[PDB]
């Protein structure tokens, strides 16, 4: 046992290691949306840097996960960091989409990581979810919302024009 | 076929998508190193820094390879990152041992990549690998093989004394 | 011969010299599609800023490669610039598309004089174009095709409105 | 006919269009001059640079005359851009005899187009060949002349020395 | 075996050390010459500051192949500095004329040691030559070159007049 | 005879020749020693950077020496330049042993040198050796000294430890 360790539970640590995996696989999905839109047929360079950013971002979200996980005296456990489970990723509208349920996706993973730290009376873990991860996660969802929202009412994915202009005015 | 596709070898595409794999993988063994050396019972917290920059400088190296596939017409074809071959890396000679080692065989690869794009004369590939990658992993292997070094001589892995000044003089 | 000449064939010589006249050819090319988005009856402003730049740019390619032959002791022969194949360009599509075609068909010279380079093991030469020439036509091209596929995107030609925005949004 | 077309003679017009051919043919004489004066066995450089800028200028002689073609609502053909006439210029002292004989060319020629212009009742293209080119030229010609005048009074072309000198003292 | 070698044929190692060995040769007759220039019955100022500083540059030119050496995990051997071949001079032109020999003689063994890397496979090292060194020979040559041309033109080496002028007026 | 030459004997111009030489020497020994600190598997980056300066600063005895001979009206004779007494130095305490032994070797040259110039009745000479050499000299042979006392009251060369923190602590 860690000789920091205190109130950390087994369950509470291993269910950060799969979170610290999920934040690593959130970092290669837009990482693989950034170069769709950098492609010489798609050509959107806002939609490519908005998703770098959020790519960049995902690592950073992952990096304080680790930084958790050893100030409680957890160990990190890494796995393989699978493929997204798309290549081509259809259109700017179809990518906000995807980002959008993929938001939604971690969202629950950190309510139920909440939960298992609730049940566990581990009140460290739980403020660490709520002031880091909760509000930066309704924030994600509500803007990919007003993307895909924005998209939709000007006619995507059928108008490239719309894209096009959504990229420059809103993304840039 | 792209529209800007030209002189751009089908093989030379998958090569570019097997190193694109590669430099994540580097990226994530470091990040690994990283938090290893972040624990409690390790707690060098140059070691962390000193390896968490060269898990982000391996991020942007595996980014500027996705930028050539697309500048060249390629598609890109993102596959699993492998979880890295240690959980453990049991101290800072021990660690920087496989970091050198690390870097020799993303080296090789980038040299047998460099005799694919020879063989099909594709001199733009030549000068991206040359200009960007050879002297940047040459430059890398000396500073890990010095660091290797000196840590033998100063007595590590037994002298924790040795790690400790270590971590401070040289990584701090 | 030149007391400076060394290493320097003379099919390497003549070669350069066709490169001179084909980058000069490019500057009048682009000369004469910016001069046609400043008619009254086309009017895209930044369109014909657009292609100035890139005019003055192939001249100083011109130039470059007429210091080169100097440097190397060649002897520079100018010979009669051909006109452009058009007057009117038609469209932003369109001249875009025809620029995407000329700088392939730069690129496809330059790649044909560093074979040449590299059968006379002329290592100075290979460093040259692929320092100052190769790059530069890749991006060139990649740069072409991504606006080639937003005006196609946009609904161009047809759509009047997609070009006046592209040059607005993308070209000012 | 265009809409912005007033008082603009299709002669005039087209009168245009050989001035165009003759200030782009200029460029490349001077073009050819200045590197030249760049060759190892020769070596006046700041020859090379004079003869360098007044090929700049040319093309801006050029570049405002398509502007004016433009603006009158004419319209632009370009034709081919003949070689210089020589291929080595000689010496300091000949070529800027040849520049002098090559500015008093284009001279006429403005001189012609303005006499066109007049008898076509075209005040605003008398007056933009008078504002932008015939001082221009009024101004070319007295330099050139100069310089010929010192380089003979300093003993060229014999006069390695003087050429020299006049490099360094005078254009430089 | 070095700990950081990987790709570096011995061959390509001792060819280095050659290499080496003729940088600092080429520094020890440019220093000869400054000083031969220093002399009462010659003085020539900035004769001899050209060839100082030259002497300068070279000596970094084998301090950076020392360093080439290293990075590669070959191991440095030197070997004595022969004397330049002349202890007098003769004139200005004439230095320069055994200056442009020495770096063409130069130029020719980095050549040789490309052709080398070539047969080896070895591409940093083909990318060290060409970036550090190729360009460097060349532009050098046509320095030297430029500098006889003109030292003969002027009417050097009976000319004193001459050498004092292109002391003042090129060098200073 | 130069017609600057006055109070300066054959013996003392031929003895100044030898003493460039032996400067010319040291500065030699000197970047040996600094680029075996340099390998990998030595990796003392501070040595090597003393080192370094100090054959830098032998090079300008050398000039200063080359200069003397110019001003007093002597011919300078220049010599092959022996190689280093070693190709590996073994280590840090060592090589600073080895220079210590280098600098009194110059001092006792330099000593001979004044002796000379004094049974010459060369006051100048005597001055110039005084001025700029002798306690240049002493300095250097001081330094040199504590430099190894403190290695070996640390325990080298035994401990590597000790010679990294000399290189951290006193070169650094
Ligand atoms: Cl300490
Ligand atoms: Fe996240
Ligand atoms: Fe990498
Ligand atoms: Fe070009
Ligand atoms: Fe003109
Ligand atoms: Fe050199
Ligand atoms: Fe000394
Ligand atoms: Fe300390
Ligand atoms: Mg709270
Ligand atoms: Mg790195
Ligand atoms: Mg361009
Ligand atoms: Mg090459
Ligand atoms: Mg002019
Ligand atoms: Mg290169
Ligand atoms: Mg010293
Ligand atoms: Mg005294």
Request: some cysteine; charged content about 30%; aromatic content about 10%.
């Amino acid at each position: 046992t860690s000789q920091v360790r205190q109130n950390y539970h087994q369950d509470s640590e291993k269910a950060i290691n799969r979170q610290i995996r999920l934040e690593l696989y959130a970092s290669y999905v837009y990482l693989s949306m950034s170069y769709y839109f950098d492609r010489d047929d798609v050509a959107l360079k806002n939609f490519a840097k908005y998703f770098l950013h959020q790519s960049h971002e995902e690592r950073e979200h992952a990096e304080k996960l680790m930084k958790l996980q050893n100030q409680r005296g957890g160990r990190i456990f890494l796995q393989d960091i699978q493929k997204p489970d798309k290549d081509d990723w259809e259109s700017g509208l179809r990518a906000m989409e995807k980002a959008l349920k993929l938001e939604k996706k971690v969202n629950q993973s950190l309510l139920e990581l909440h939960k298992l730290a609730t049940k566990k009376n581990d009140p460290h873990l739980c403020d660490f979810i709520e002031t880091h991860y909760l509000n930066e996660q309704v924030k994600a969802i509500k803007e990919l919302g007003d993307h895909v929202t924005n998209l939709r009412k000007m006619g995507a994915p059928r108008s490239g024009l719309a894209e096009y202009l959504f990229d420059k005015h809103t993304l840039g």
